[PDB]
Design a protein around this ligand. Structure first.
Ligand code: NAD
Ligand code: NAD
Ligand code: NAD
Ligand code: NAD
Lengths: 239, 255, 255, 239
């Protein structure tokens, strides 16, 4: 069984990739950062797993298709895609520009359209169904202040997860999403700095928290679940 | 007299909204990319005793949106309400959606609302008071629709924007709410039904009926249904409501 | 003149709703278990030119609810709107909630709405037309509140009832919607704040303030805020809306 | 590790119980039907697992507490409770009586209050946190026609899951729920008969579908998730 994870060079994506390896997947480590992607892939291969690094800008449709097919050929199948890559824009709502919007929507939303399309083609090529797993956010469930552009892209991903699930279900292809809360990654190590210029369980999130949920969404135990965006936020928003 | 600007007011839901707001006592800027229909609606209002001005604007263009709001503020002598209503539909199987499709529909359906919010906030500040921002979402913003994936995702984005902007702008005394129509017999559903017909081979009208079979109240919607809700959202009775996307869909989805 | 019955109309939100519906032109039945306040509010309406009757009813009693609606229908000469507003709050840590607590609050807050719906539907049929059913939910029906578990669960139940009844009754031309107030300074929050104070030791008023810190618009709610929404829900402008629970909470939760 | 599952004599509850056994739990089979409960418990024990049958009417607070403590003593711990027992009332909205409401609320809602309270006491006794897992329904997310009383009880359970999660999180106790769709069990083999007098994946649900989700909710992989009601309905409602 084969999975491709975008943004897997670090943070949540990396934790997801390592957990899927533990679960028995061969994993394509897809990232625009080929240095971290190759480092993660090498770590997996050293430890006896099976991984390959693929460089891709997920806002580029051709590169997304190329990444999926490369994964499929090299790893010998294709069963799961995790559309995880994304960026945060910490800019006041009134200061958001058209260029900002074009960038963040291409990276956070169009990428998921492209990933869905490429994955479905690979599933068909392999002659079976599959699982599409999308990174949303708590900001996809309740809009977050000063992260206005970001929030709206994650709402769009939530919507995409629903509509794609409806359309692809007859093919035996499911589409679900995960909604992290506040996770101490590089993303929040930039949100932190830009913000300067609630959790029921009473602790911030670690990438492994999300990885555990994605393990379920990649497993047969989630076969009959589709179109859902699941919160693993330590109890911030209830849905 | 308070002042409202309604985008996409040349026809359909926007036109109905504009006419109802006139009835409620607003002076209204009729904003549309279609100059002829905008002028026609404005003329129809002025000849029936109301006060309206036509403003040609492509809402996907930020500079034009600011220009439209400023023109409304100057000509009508105030600015109290903006209705971000203009939008388009795309009808295409998910796997066939192109990057160009996405760039177009997000520009028109989503970026436009960012620009409308920004322009209105600046106008409210120049007028020295708060205000109301009202966004056209959709039932497709609550549950994603089959064969209209691009459209559905833009409306989800508008729903999210309504929430986020409501949080951010509340300290300024500015509220942000949305309306979610169901299946409304406008030019847009004429288009949707026709394009669905080409895809699945069902005769003209049949797709409209099947998408409408889910409606509890047992009839499709008319633009006036939506105008009534927007009247509330433009009135002082909605002053303490913000961040909400309200369904007036005859009972298709419950939220 | 159309006819509305409002339960819990002796004081607080119910009283404000009743007075606003009178302003809108309804004849109103003032329904309350408190006979004195019901009579007082009815008298206050009649002495100011409106038309009202006081009806003593325990809404947890099905026979009394039917009797109250029938009395309203006969005395006021019609029946068009019912507002199921009467309710109580309990304030108690989750692990300390008793079976007797549950039996009481579900009887008053939930079963009452079943009975109101049933009584109103029968009345609408006797009058030979459709109608509007309007239920008091809560922000606690959308997100469960700490230390008010019993109350929160009853309001979730009312939210569900609003949806289910909307589906079932739509063919009869009867709509069912709900309103979700936020933090409203009534006798109920006087009680809640006092009981929370006894639990966590914070001075009177401080719990009310902390529960209100989440409000985007930066002020607690007054009953008039809710009355404005219910005015819309009682008006023809909401005819095509059904099954919805609408938040007017100053921006605490977004739905 | 020890789990108690109510309504485990048959249907979804039984499937949940058997899956938790496979996962390594000792399981208390709790039911008002002691015959089926004892049969399921015996099946588990015969196969090398560890189970005990407990008779309980979950609408009876004292019996719920007694069942939990019996499980705790006999099986040697207490880590998970699954509040699964419930009934359906297929009665027209206008025909619903006060007696109907008293019955269905005591069985479907009060039971979950009681189960939560009893489980928390056992968790404290054992000196650790735990997992509370509640059976909601698709009818808890969108109200279902002609199942009006039922729908409202499941909405209440959804609300209870949220509020209890908020209150119990500081104790390291989580509360989540599962929302089955249309499952071919004895319950729908009564709803079927009373109804007489949409699924994206294009097939009805089997009890094992739900069991897979509950396995996740009983596992460490769900530790950071709380207050959520998760749909596994084959794509009927999206949340
Ligand atoms: N961090 C949080 O608290 C949080 C909360 C909610 C949701 N999320 C979501 O989870 C996902 C992962 O977040 P994270 O915190 O690990 O982020 P991160 O910034 O730590 O990692 C992002 C990774 O994606 C890669 N990437 C960025 N843009 C790319 C592009 N155009 N093409 C290919 N790769 C690209 C980066 O190189 C990086 O390796 C994101 O979608 C984020 O929106 C994160
Ligand atoms: N069933 C429905 O019709 C339905 C349902 C849900 C939501 N909505 C939403 O309601 C809104 C109005 O829909 P409608 O049915 O009245 O549509 P319509 O096609 O009848 O009218 C759209 C109007 O917007 C104008 N417009 C389009 N693009 C523009 C641009 N870039 N700049 C300025 N003006 C532009 C058009 O000229 C036209 O006058 C839309 O946002 C739509 O998404 C409609
Ligand atoms: N912050 C808030 O006050 C708030 C917030 C959300 C929802 N609500 C809901 O709004 C509704 C009105 O609340 P309020 O703040 O005006 O309450 P309140 O306590 O001020 O008034 C309640 C009224 O209901 C009457 N009543 C109580 N039990 C009754 C019974 N069994 N039969 C008949 N009448 C009965 C009382 O006599 C009283 O007149 C309630 O359903 C409440 O749950 C209130
Ligand atoms: N079957 C479905 O399609 C469906 C859909 C959504 C939700 N659910 C929920 O899943 C849960 C399990 O449903 P199911 O279909 O397996 O039901 P079922 O009728 O097949 O099994 C119910 C079990 O609970 C037991 N039980 C009933 N009342 C009890 C009481 N008072 N005390 C103790 N035990 C009692 C019964 O003896 C039986 O063993 C229920 O809560 C139901 O509401 C079911």
């Amino acid at each position: 069984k084969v999975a491709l994870v975008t943004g897997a060079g670090q943070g949540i994506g990396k934790a997801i990739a390592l957990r899927l390896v533990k679960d028995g997947f061969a994993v394509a480590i897809a990232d625009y950062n080929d240095a971290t992607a190759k480092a993660v892939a090498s770590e997996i291969n050293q430890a006896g797993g099976h991984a390959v690094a693929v460089k891709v800008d997920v806002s580029d449709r051709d590169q997304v298709f190329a990444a999926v097919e490369q994964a499929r050929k090299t790893l010998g199948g294709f069963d799961v895609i995790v559309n995880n890559a994304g960026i945060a824009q910490i800019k006041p709502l009134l200061e958001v520009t058209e260029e900002d919007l074009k960038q963040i929507y291409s990276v956070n939303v169009f990428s998921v359209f492209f990933g869905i399309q490429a994955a479905v083609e690979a599933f068909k090529k392999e002659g079976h169904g599959g699982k599409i797993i999308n990174a949303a956010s708590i900001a996809a469930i309740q809009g977050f202040p000063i992260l206005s552009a970001y929030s709206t892209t994650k709402f769009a991903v939530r919507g995409l997860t629903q509509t794609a699930a409806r359309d692809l279900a007859p093919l035996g292809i499911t589409v679900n999403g995960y909604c992290p809360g506040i996770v101490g990654t590089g993303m929040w190590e930039q949100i932190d700095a830009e913000l300067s210029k609630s959790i029921a369980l009473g602790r911030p999130s670690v990438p492994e928290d999300v990885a555990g949920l994605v393990s379920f969404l990649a497993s047969p135990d989630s076969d009959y679940m589709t179109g859902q965006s699941l919160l693993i936020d330590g109890g911030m928003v209830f849905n």
